[model samples]
Target: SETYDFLFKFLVIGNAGTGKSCLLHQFIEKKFKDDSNHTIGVEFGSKIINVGGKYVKLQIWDTAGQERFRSVTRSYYRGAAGALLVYDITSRETYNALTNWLTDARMLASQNIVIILCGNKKDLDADREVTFLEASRFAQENELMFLETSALTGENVEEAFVQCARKILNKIESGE
Candidate 1:
């Protein structure tokens, strides 16, 4: 089998504690934590694995707060073919701050990047301040792929990555 080398670098951007790191950890490693220490300027981890019977290298990057790390992490968005914009379902502020992140991403990332609006901590429904319908609407309005996931329980975690990979790979294979 020809191992189609798909070298797609994806970015995870959002405010702190939105499970940005957790989501990346789960999708890249098939695992997650209940709690993780805060990330500074930038945190990086990568996994080169199989997706849809082909070899794909998923270089996932996680970044810190936008206000302080704007200069430091903005450059990290370069070369990224996809993005996961994460936000805690319990925090509205994180959701509101998404536009600025999108602006920075649009400025630095690949032109045809696939952006996934990820409402993380979906298992926290009891404390959720955001709804699936609202998040879906937000993503649609912004022209992004939308999904609700529980990084803690590994819910929809793998699906997000595989789906993104599938979409990007299709475009590449189709010579888009």
Candidate 2:
């Protein structure tokens, strides 16, 4: 199906309760996927998006993110064109776990893969646990694009994925 100029593989990596699945549902369905702890090995979701006047079908693979599934999900990182790392805005533990999550991405995914870091659950900003500045600094130091998102409110959810796709396209053009 050459319905698009290019197809991209993106993985959503994060700890549980960070709303990884919810974010995916919101971005694709444009509606929130209510909270639930259903078990999932890997969920495949895709949406065709526009980038630089070209159509690109971006696939987002949502993982269970539980320690028991780490080894299983690692395989999905293979040839990943882009990676989206998410953490709960009101959960400092989730933010602290990013370093571990990122080390895997850097080791298992393609070196050229562009990763976008998202601090989700913005709807609970009033009970914030991690500051935007701290997260931005971490993302900048790691050379990742960072954005605050609220999957419940569907804020910045679309932009995060589109940005991931755009970066991959830029990398391709640069022949990286």
Specify the highest-lDDT model's number: 2
In model 1, where do residues sit more than 4 Å from their true spots?
1-4
Look at candidate 1 and tell me the lDDT of residue 4. 45
Looking at model 1, the pairs that clash are none
Tens-digit lDDT track of model 2 for 34-93:
755744688889999878789999878888888888888899889789988999999999
Q: Alpha carbon lDDT of residue 20, candidate 2?
A: 88
| lDDT by residue (tens digit), candidate 1, 51-170 | 767888887888876466768778877788887888899999999988888998878887778887888888889999988888888888998888889988998888787778788887
CA lDDT of every candidate:
0.81, 0.90
Badly placed stretches (over 4 Å) of model 2 are: none
Residue clash pairs of candidate 2: none
Q: Estimate each model's TM-score.
A: 0.90, 0.95
